[PDB]
Amino acid sequence: MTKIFAYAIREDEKPFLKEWEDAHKDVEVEYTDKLLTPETVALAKGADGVVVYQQLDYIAETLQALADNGITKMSLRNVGVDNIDMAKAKELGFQITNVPVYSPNAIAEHAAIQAARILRQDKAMDEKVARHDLRWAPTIGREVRDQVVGVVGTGHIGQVFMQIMEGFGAKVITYDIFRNPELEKKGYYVDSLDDLYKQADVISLHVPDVPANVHMINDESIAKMKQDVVIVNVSRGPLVDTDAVIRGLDSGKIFGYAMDVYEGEVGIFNEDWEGKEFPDARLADLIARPNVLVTPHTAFYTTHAVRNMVVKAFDNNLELVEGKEAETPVKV
């Protein structure tokens, strides 16, 4: 019937799902809150395609129970095409889409806000106020505009962050391996990551989790940095050696750290550990420091992003199902 079955649908997604349905009243759309598992495939039996979103791997077993239920078209509401048993997929002739770009501003705004907060010592101030210590001193702020902001990576997110930081009046330098000519005209780029580290008050990372960048922030890069540097990371956990940032924080060289991602987040992030034994003492410690901001991989999480995740996933699924060129197919 042109029946799209969706898994893992969240409450906050429903509004964009309804919307999608109202623009495609001829399409039958069903969904569950459950994740896609070899036992949950049977739920999409009848559907022409499934829209999915979950870190729970896409196990061959799973893909297989899907095809055995007649489904071979899959639309990711996210970017990641990682937990997908790819050899299996190609085997069953799986057609797969994802959502590569939903809202770059979501992540860039989060980085921007978290940096500014750390500069302002807003967390120390919030903590004082919550205990009813309303004295100013000694929690004096640092203006964003008084900073040199170093952006590592000038892709979709990095450029929006630069945009935002320039709006504040900060002096913005950048570093990327491939210089976008427009930015190159402008003069943003510096020649070496080292030039960035020596002059930036604020460093933000907008670079992929590639092996050459793993732990690029470490004891050696931190030792190059300016006194009172602020580091922001909303890209990928493994970019940063947490123990070296903790060292930097402890020696007083690192002014503060904002992280939305963490090298040990898998299995920790996106779980309620209230009233339970927190699994990672190091993360627990970071969460409590006055000059560190931990968010559980939430930089993407905005009404705008979520809107685009839903709608675009359903646009791609319908396109797969209607034998149309998919907008954002995954190279299988």
Ligand X SMILES: NC(=O)c1ccc[n+]([C@@H]2O[C@H](COP(=O)([O-])OP(=O)(O)OC[C@H]3O[C@@H](n4cnc5c(N)ncnc54)[C@H](O)[C@@H]3O)[C@@H](O)[C@H]2O)c1
Residues that bind a copy of itself (CB under 8 A): 10-12, 103, 105-106, 109-110, 112-113, 116-117, 120, 122, 125-126, 128-146, 160, 163-169, 268-274, 276, 278, 284, 287-288, 293-298, 301-306
Known binder of ligand: residue 235?
yes
Query: Does 8 participate in binding ligand X (rule CB under 6 A)?
Result: no
Which listed range, 23-31, 62-70, 83-91, 148-156, lies at the site for ligand X (CB under 6 A)?
148-156
To the question of whether residue 310 is assigned a binding role by annotation, the answer is no
Report the residue from 178, 192, 211, 275 that binds ligand X according to the rule CB under 6 A: 178
265 catalytically annotated: yes
Contacts of 63 (CB under 8 A, 6+ apart): 84, 85, 88, 89, 92, 94
Distance CA 58, CA 76 (A): 11
Q: Is 207 annotated as a binding residue?
A: yes
Is 176 annotated in a binding site? The answer is: yes
d(CA 272, CA 320): 37
Query: How far apart are alpha carbons 316 and 82 in whole angstroms?
Result: 18
Q: Minimum Å distance from CB 236 to ligand X? A: 4
What is the nearest approach in angstroms of a copy of itself to the Cβ of residue 228? 11
Cα Rg of the chain, angstroms: 22
* Binder among 79, 124, 190, 246 for ligand X (CB under 6 A): 79
177 binds, among a copy of itself, ligand X, none (CB under 5 to 8 A by kind): ligand X
Question: Does the annotation list 208 as a binding residue?
Answer: yes
Q: Which helix (H) or strand (E) holds 209?
A: none
> What's the order of all strands across the beta sheet hosting 254-259?
171-175, 148-152, 202-205, 229-233, 254-259, 292-294
Q: Which of 13, 260, 263, 319 binds ligand X (CB under 6 A)?
A: 260
The token pair that represents 148 in the structure block: 């040199």
The CA-CA-CA angle for residues 218, 219, 223, to 5°, reads 115
- Residues identified as active-site: 236, 265, 297
| Known binding-site residue numbers for NAD(+) | 156-157, 176, 207-208, 213, 234-236, 260
